[PDB]
Amino acid sequence: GHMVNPTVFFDIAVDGEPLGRVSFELFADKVPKTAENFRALSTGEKGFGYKGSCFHRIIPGFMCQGGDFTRHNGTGGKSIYGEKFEDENFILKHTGPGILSMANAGPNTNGSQFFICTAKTEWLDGKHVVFGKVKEGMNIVEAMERFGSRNGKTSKKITIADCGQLE
Ligand SMILES: CC(C)[C@H](NC(=O)OC(C)(C)C)C(=O)N[C@H]1Cc2cccc(c2)OCCCCOC(=O)[C@@H]2CCCN(N2)C1=O
Numbered sequence: 001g002h003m004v005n006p007t008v009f010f011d012i013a014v015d016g017e018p019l020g021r022v023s024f025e026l027f028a029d030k031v032p033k034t035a036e037n038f039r040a041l042s043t044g045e046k047g048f049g050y051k052g053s054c055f056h057r058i059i060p061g062f063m064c065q066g067g068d069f070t071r072h073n074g075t076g077g078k079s080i081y082g083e084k085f086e087d088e089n090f091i092l093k094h095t096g097p098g099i100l101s102m103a104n105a106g107p108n109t110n111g112s113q114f115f116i117c118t119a120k121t122e123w124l125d126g127k128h129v130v131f132g133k134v135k136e137g138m139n140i141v142e143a144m145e146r147f148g149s150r151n152g153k154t155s156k157k158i159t160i161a162d163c164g165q166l167e
Helices: 032-043 136-147
Strands: 007-014 017-026 057-059 064-065 099-102 114-117 131-136 159-166
Touching: 007 032, 007 136, 017 032, 017 136, 032 131, 032 159, 064 136, 064 159, 131 136
Parallel strands: none
Antiparallel strands: 007 017, 007 159, 017 131, 057 064, 064 114, 099 114, 099 131
């Protein structure tokens, strides 16, 4: 039947203590290649992905950034496509808190790093591929956000203790 946009979850921990679950709708109907990358990295089904990785940069009033599961500091990560991959489209815009979007290092350099907006970030439109949104647990993102700082360093260790697909 109809392709249903996937739902994936992160179970977040703070210095190893459970915080809560954030779930995301992935817009596979608009950005299928970008949605599939994040989906597969969330289930771990290729043998690598987000489980155990950290949020390395959190700026209150802006965004939480994660997905560097290879170097844990924003210099690493990889997609499921054996190389960085193209900006699929910029159809979806950075409209407010909860938007899930790809981090990158230039045109057509998407890997595994992503960010969750905690504010409207419209100046990123046409530069970062929006591919999902928080579905449930925006309150957990708001709780994470409090452990960031102006320069992005986190004051507690924010990890994805578990992750996977709900639907
Ligand atoms: C994904 C890694 C590989 C990549 N590395 C990188 O490009 O490395 C160099 C510079 C080539 C060596 C990176 O992290 N890309 C950054 C670029 C950026 C964009 C917009 C503003 C930026 C930086 O900085 C200003 C504000 C700092 C806080 O906002 C942030 O950190 C942003 C928040 C959105 C996601 N976001 N990070 C990125 O897509």
